[model samples]
Target: EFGSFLVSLGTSFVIFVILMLLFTWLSRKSGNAPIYYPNRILKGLEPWEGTSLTRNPFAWMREALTSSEQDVVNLSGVDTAVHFVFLSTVLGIFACSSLLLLPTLLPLAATDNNIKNTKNATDTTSKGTFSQLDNLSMANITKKSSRLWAFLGAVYWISLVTYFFLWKAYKHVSSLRAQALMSADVKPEQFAILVRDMPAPPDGQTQKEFIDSYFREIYPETFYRSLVATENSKVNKIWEKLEGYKKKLARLINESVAKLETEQKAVLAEKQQTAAVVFFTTRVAAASAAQSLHCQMVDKWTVTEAPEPRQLLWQNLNIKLFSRIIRQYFIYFFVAVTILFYMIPIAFVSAITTLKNLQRIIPFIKPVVEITAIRTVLESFLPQIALIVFLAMLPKLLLFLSKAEGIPSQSHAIRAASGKYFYFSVFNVFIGVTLAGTLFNTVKDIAKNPKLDMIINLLATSLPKSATFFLTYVALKFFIGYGLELSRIIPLIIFHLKKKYLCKTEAEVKEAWYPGDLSYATRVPGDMLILTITFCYSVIAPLILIFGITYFGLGWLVLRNQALKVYVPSYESYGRMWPHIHQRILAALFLFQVVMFGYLGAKTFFYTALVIPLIITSLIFGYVCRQKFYGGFEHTALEVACRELKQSPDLEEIFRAYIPH
Candidate 1:
């Protein structure tokens, strides 16, 4: 018996239980609810200090310059589409992993095994040796003929899709988590702007003055200044033009300054229109997807009727609108660059250690890592890290550039932008996803034999094309390049509207913040220790050997942000820093993104890229939900708006009873 292992585990668990109980009891003794941890490190900062943006016109300009033109109207929901598509695609994978897929494919696997039984698994070892750890002897030439091989191949191919979609989900999840991770730190950093290492000015700064100074001078420099950098030439030119356009925008800003200076700018009262549309769409898709998933009964914990449309509505509906797009884009770039730039020191250290390790191993190849193809490839991909920043910020930069460039305003600029966003979002996501699938099959030669190719072949044959590839070509081109653009592009549009409608300009909104930046100085030990511990724990607790994703994973943000004090406590303070923790979610997401981007980038670069688009549209379909269910963010905005409505439109006691939660 592995009783020793069991006993050790039991002992450790017992120790943990005692600690948990003690902690729980101690906090409760004081009549205060205790969170998972005091999160004192994160709690060091107060609520108002958390939500803020560090202004940067120079950075914005540099980024805008790198963006492309057609990439402009990309505000057409491309980002949203990408978000949804990838999320759905990945969720589909989780669904598959959950159960039904295995059962559904069992027959195919078994049948394929019967066909390929005569053939030893060794034949397919490197690429296709699918081991049945349970000894499900699948391939026997005699018992399971070539026909079965083909059939099984079909099953395998379809199963391959499960992995791909899962990977896609992973990529999307990573993107999502990364965004959150970045924002968690970034939002606080924004607040860090006003924070001082020393005490603040003898005379404190006013909110409006902060708005005026920060937005007009400091913020513009932060944003517009660098949007035109050489990371992407096309983006730079667009940004240059956008810079030219800013002169007029300045005029408009002058006119709108009063509106921007309003007091106690509440977040909840804002009702982002896009949030409503997204909600409606999400309502239908969620219901349908729910029906489909549960119709066959996957059964994931109290899996109620896929949460009614009403259930998913956001509590805070302050959609950031285009501002989010621009903000996120630059935010992503700045942070990504900072992290990457910082990697130089780490990489050097690792390289030194890696060289020492190699000397211990096959020492001959040690220099290979130092100067060979391996090192070259590493170096190549190292710079390609810019791709992450570029693509991440492309759409937003494009929009910012368009407005900045003095390109004559289209009478329907907003409408055109929104419409294009919607179209491309659909094309890139839904069409793109279908195409990614199609292209994956094409590359793998799934069409060689229809009878053997089962699901994919069946799916493909349902389409119309010639020369096999032509059959799926319709949806193919759609998802690849055009499709992937949706996620960043579209959500950007919606968020843009949200920001415009609610906060209107950067000035109206505030990055919930306090004084004293997390400091390059104060953050040294805490940040290092936190990062180190988090890194180690993440690796130690991984579900799979997912690189160092745990430490760097998106989920780690909860811990990191908690450690870094990322969030703003709500009115109903549970005082638990990680109240909405999802276990190792960031790890999973990062790993998944790596797999997806790699696969899509390779096996089906065109369609795989579409994964981003699919993520967007699908999200629009899944989450662009109702005014009521927009989650904490949107709902918060809605509450604010609701309060605004109550204060303005002659109070009616009659409406009080009608407000739903």
Candidate 2:
């Protein structure tokens, strides 16, 4: 009990220290703006007293936003950590308490002594079962608690695995898109679509080798005449001409293939096998055929990531794989954010606690490992390796969250599943997370309690990090860096970049219209009212949702992609809103955590097992409230003016129209 208290306190200290560091970094950045932005401009009386930003005034907004974005970017690492593993032991604790201690809560509720053994726990959906199980007055606590716990447990594990596997896919998809954008051969999907649309040969060519012997290699440029002709009011001629060519080409190709087959009958078998081999070979790299294309190739200079077939400009980089991994990390920035803020506390605390009891659990886990036939699997999962992967993935996710483009296309479930190759590597990374924590705690518990260590050390002395290296190496680098960066740099980077570079909110995609009140309000309250809460959550959640929508929603298939190619928007038009989205999500997370702290501070106890779900319920309720709230820039200026009007009558004639109702 005493040891547990120490662990909890240490965890809180980690949080407080990180929070203090972030708070200090933000203050420092807010005070000293010029080092970061060498060319900040504002309409002022004089440029000389740049020193007195308070007097200069406009720099205040610049400095302040910079500081905010930095905090957001910084927190992403720690925040991701927070999402994983906190609930692990929380679930474990709930299970132990709900199942084991119910009879103790009311001795009259007891029927037997089965704390360690659960034989009498029959699988049934009955009131009598709950009474025997939990011994509560209302009698639903036992079954309901189990259901809720099981469901939460499932959510925890599924999301955990999903994030790990999906992260790599997420990384690759975006990276591929980036590469595709940089290129301008066919559209990102022209090759795929062309292959799909190509006519099927007489099965002698077997669709694979059909392209060379039978399919016509027509350029998409032929379709351009239709656009020009439409403008000139001669679209009918263009359509008729296109129809004639398509039919004629199909007939000619079929006749040519049939003649070739009859003439080359001796080589037909070899050709069939050759087609299969060639088909698979081309299929592998075909998706990336339009890679490393340059800007000039884009007819409209709108930008693209298409490469012509056999374009060897990027063969040296094999950038497709690396880009894919990077993209996964970027798209799943939520995992990073959760770890940074949430998991840091849990892991650090758990480390301290488990270390203190290493004497007891270490030896106990050995028998469990041995008896379970999973010891081989368990041994390979060390804490250090897990920590390293988390650290590596955390920053990438933060970067991606700050930069991810929301997918713009819609897809059904099958199509979405097909797109998994692009965004699901996150689930793989999540495995490293689970294995890392499990190994850490398993070793730690053994080390802290010698009695347990005595049994396990016989089999696993090869496993432990001897002579107390935990604080010096393991703890400082992974946990500290993740938490520290978020608290310091993430927020300021995001806020400053968005505030200055943007005339629009992150959510507003269409340009030219003034960004209305809603975007302004989300930040104002998140940043000014409860700055930390706003910055942290905003950095993670909003971006995660947007990331999810985009990765699956906007597909880069052939024909539609050609449409995107034709209607492409410039960077100035719509490219870098991911950072803004990240910041908004971070802001929401901040507010959510604040309310969570408020509840904890209120001293509301579970008292009994039934109330455990409320702890999480309250947080969701608070977050939903914040999420539902929207603000507008028009309201900011209007509210004050209208309030003054109610108090008395003071109006400039033009101001009346400017103020919103």
Candidate 3:
């Protein structure tokens, strides 16, 4: 019945591939009709246009891997280019690590001598292929403790490789980002500041004029315009209805050949807000304003460079700065509690998904699972399915929680969401799923024993056995998920259903046709979780490496295609995400070192404590990278900001740009 897992994996992959090719061919054969082939990648013919249905996906994959980072950058922008480069780095690093691991670590683990030795220590018999996974672990290498030298050497080598590559990649990306920022014409945001919590107007001046006057006095030559931001939800709701009416009227007029008329309605609105968009004539002035405190009062009248207008949280604009900070911490606390509580559902699912427990949970189900095939599917996939379903819903809540933090930009919201999701994945997916019932018992015993061997034996015995679940999880995620993204059947169905029954006007049709932005908030964190799993088990179970390589390899191919044609970018952070990526990589490496220590100690190997200093060294390395280079990755470097200064727009135009859009 293990073959059923393989059949499910292979069958799902084939079905998805066939469906994708069929749909793509149909779209092109329809002459790129708007209804069926709305996405440009399914429309245009020229390769340079990057919309040809077949050519584009293949070309994107080629360009993503073979072309220079600068070249791919020229195609879209630096943010996407860095994404491609970093993905390539992730694939290359792990794939190479897996290759080296298979020859050295795999043999040490898979040999019968090691398993027999470790089995005696645990008083457990090795009976299944899953049991071999435990043998392949460092716990199996039991030749008088001398056998652990290779593993220790490997641990140091891998740590050094990861640190060296991470630092090198960071340095390259930092310089590349600087060059990219300078390569283009100066942006309006480069010379603009978003001054929040504007103090009450001086004497007779409005908030806009109040901010203008203060900044003008500070930099008379550079100060140009100010536009206030208001609480706009009520007006926006009214505006949407009004526009819908106008669009319906226009459609009736066009379709009927008779004049169509509609009543005009008015809505009350605000002209001022607590926040001001203050534009300066030079980039340095904007940077200075963003970095400096703008008021004598402690937290009032704060200034930072303007975020993309689309990213503003209209509701949060009304909250005071002090209150927002308190709420932000509350959100963080909420996330932790949510993650811990989620384990309840997962544990319940784990408990009942087995055949014996399934009947207990639902007495009537005895008839269905009595079938061998049904029993196999339920037994094999049910636990993973429950976890996946729970995970699916949690990210949406995470995004909402992140948005409630009053962050100014969607990109920041995504970064915050990604961090939250990472923690949740680590706990629920890695820690909770792996340990299950044994984890509670092991920790309780460890509390009594309080020895390195206890902790070592606990993790060593548990981690490898979980490989089957994680491997199957990876296959379901990337193999099947990639195909679904390519076809986009659900969104396509929704779009068409809306078009047929709901859309009353061309504008409505256009709205229905809109392809959404990339789901970076969920997707990035999910991929990082995959990377975490890959690194964690690279040595303990090299079979995961096969799936890991396939995950990233196929990920590179599929995501490259999607980035080129399907998803429109909401806002550009210009590789601002690299710091998060780099930090998480170091975190994964630190985890790897710790687990290596456990494996060594489980074998009763000498000098197992040495890994503690190595772990300390990785931590210091991360701290050094943070101090020396992370700021450059997060924000525009000052030298680049100074060198890239440009003339500001007309004051009227600059003011109009930010006025309640």
What is the C-alpha lDDT profile of model 1 across 514-541, one tens digit per residue?
1122121111211222222222122111
1 versus 3: better lDDT goes to:
3
Candidates in order, TM-scores: namely: 0.24, 0.27, 0.83
The residue ranges of model 2 lying beyond 4 angstroms of the native Cα positions read 1-483, 486-661
Arrange candidates, best lDDT first.
Answer: 3, 2, 1
Q: What lDDT would each prediction earn against the true structure?
A: 0.27, 0.28, 0.66
lDDT of 2 by residue, 402-514 (tens): 33322212111111222221122222322222223345534443444456313222111111121012221222232343343324344445545555685364333122112
Q: What lDDT is reached at residue 376 by model 2? A: 21
Give the candidate number with the greatest TM-score: 3
lDDT of 3: 0.66
Put down candidate 3 lDDT per residue, 399-486, tens digits, no spaces.
8998887777777788888888888877676666556633532444355556574466555555555655567677877767877776
- Alpha carbon deviation, residue 125, candidate 1 (Å): 17
